[PDB]
Amino acid sequence: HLPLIAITRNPVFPRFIKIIEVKNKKLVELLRRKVRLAQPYVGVFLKRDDSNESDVVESLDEIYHTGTFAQIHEMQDLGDKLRMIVMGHRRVHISRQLEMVEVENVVHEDFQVTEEVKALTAEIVKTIRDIIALNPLYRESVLQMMQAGQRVVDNPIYLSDMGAALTGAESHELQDVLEETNIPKRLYKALSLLKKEFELSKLQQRLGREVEEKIKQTHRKYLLQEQLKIIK
Amino acid sequence: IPKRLYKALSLLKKEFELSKLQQRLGREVEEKIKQTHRKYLLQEQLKIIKKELGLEKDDKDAIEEKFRERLKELVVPKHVMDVVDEELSKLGLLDNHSSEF
Amino acid sequence: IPKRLYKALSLLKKEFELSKLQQRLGREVEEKIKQTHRKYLLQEQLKIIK
Numbered sequence: 001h002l003p004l005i006a007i008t009r010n011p012v013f014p015r016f017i018k019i020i021e022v023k024n025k026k027l028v029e030l031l032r033r034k035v036r037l038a039q040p041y042v043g044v045f046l047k048r049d050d051s052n053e054s055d056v057v058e059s060l061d062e063i064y065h066t067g068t069f070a071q072i073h074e075m076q077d078l079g080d081k082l083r084m085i086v087m088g089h090r091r092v093h094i095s096r097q098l099e100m101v102e103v104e105n106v107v108h109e110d111f112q113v114t115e116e117v118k119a120l121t122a123e124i125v126k127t128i129r130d131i132i133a134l135n136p137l138y139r140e141s142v143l144q145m146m147q148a149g150q151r152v153v154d155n156p157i158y159l160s161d162m163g164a165a166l167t168g169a170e171s172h173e174l175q176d177v178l179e180e181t182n183i184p185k186r187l188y189k190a191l192s193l194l195k196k197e198f199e200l201s202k203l204q205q206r207l208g209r210e211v212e213e214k215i216k217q218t219h220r221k222y223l224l225q226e227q228l229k230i231i232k
Numbered sequence: 233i234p235k236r237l238y239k240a241l242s243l244l245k246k247e248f249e250l251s252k253l254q255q256r257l258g259r260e261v262e263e264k265i266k267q268t269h270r271k272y273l274l275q276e277q278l279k280i281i282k283k284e285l286g287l288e289k290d291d292k293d294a295i296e297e298k299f300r301e302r303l304k305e306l307v308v309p310k311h312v313m314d315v316v317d318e319e320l321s322k323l324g325l326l327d328n329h330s331s332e333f
Numbered sequence: 334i335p336k337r338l339y340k341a342l343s344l345l346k347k348e349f350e351l352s353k354l355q356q357r358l359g360r361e362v363e364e365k366i367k368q369t370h371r372k373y374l375l376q377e378q379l380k381i382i383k
Contacts, residue, residue, distance in 0.1 A: 116250065191258065196268075199273060207277070207378070211377055280378070281378075284375040
């Protein structure tokens with residue numbers, strides 16, 4: 001029941017530490033007004049097409065109905081005066097933000113047989129492992145800490161979200177995956193997103209080795225011609 | 233001995249069958265994503281051409297862009313236009329600092 | 334004895350600054366060469382894709 005925040009280009013994927021550094025100075029007044037609460041919290045939302053900070057403060061329809069309530073970690077202000085840390089813990093999809101009413105409709109229906117439902121997880125983690133091996137993005141200690149063989153994945157949906165967060169697809173695609181209600185449908189799209197990044201990555205590696213090997217085919221023949229010259 | 237041998241083989245068969253049906257569904261997903269047009273892949277490379285450097289300064293592209301938006305305004309003919317286009321190709325061949333540049 | 338230690342140490346620091354200056358100068362010139370050829374890789378990638 002707080003006025004909307006100026007997210008200012010900061011996606012907070014579920015189970016993914018993130019930082020928010022809004023440029024406006026009117027939000028610092030609200031951040032200083034909420035230190036009195038015993039259980040403080042802050043929400044994180046996603047922006048609609050054609051981002052505009054003036055529309056966030058002018059109108060309240062721009063922000064998506066989805067929200068991510070969470071608890072604060074610690075304020076710092078090392079360099080800037082507005083450096084808050086954010087995380088994605090409590091997802092919400094407001095029925096009507098304009099008319100804030102909210103409800104934790106965090107559906108996670110699953111069929112009784114949960115045996116063949118983890119076969120897709122194996123493909124998601126092997127494809128993500130191949131994305132970080134052929135296209136290394138993040139550290140590999142996090143993958144060894146949270147393994148699928150440890151039985152510590154109390155929220156498979158959250159771990160799948162953690163895996164789908166590695167994709168660089170525009171925010172809209174993430175919103176589209178969030179709109180999906182069935183679990184295999186969003187997982188199928190997440191796998192598709194993973195391959196979608198994979199195509200670009202494989203293209204980039206082929207292009208890099210191609211240009212580099214072309215440079216070598218240049219200079220190696222120059223080494224041969226240089227040998228020719230010196231013998232001449 | 234024959235029971236353990238067949239059950240072990242069966243375990244390999246069924247686990248491979250799960251991996252095979254899932255891998256086939258994934259190959260089909262790969263086919264449906266590969267349906268994405270080749271323009272998207274070449275467009276990714278097109279963005280890579282413009283996103284290797286940070287700024288537009290200290291380059292022949294800068295001058296090429298001011299003169300080329302010019303070219304777009306003043307309605308050049310097909311001859312002089314193509315002649316300056318091929319000459320601009322040479323200017324691309326020409327060095328950033330050469331005295332002839 | 335502490336004065337000779339002071340003067341000898343002063344000589345050590347005097348050499349240490351000049352030496353560090355020479356290495357900094359060398360790495361700077363070399364990094365200019367690296368940024369040259371690396372930007373050549375970027376412009377070459379631009380060429381090949383174009």
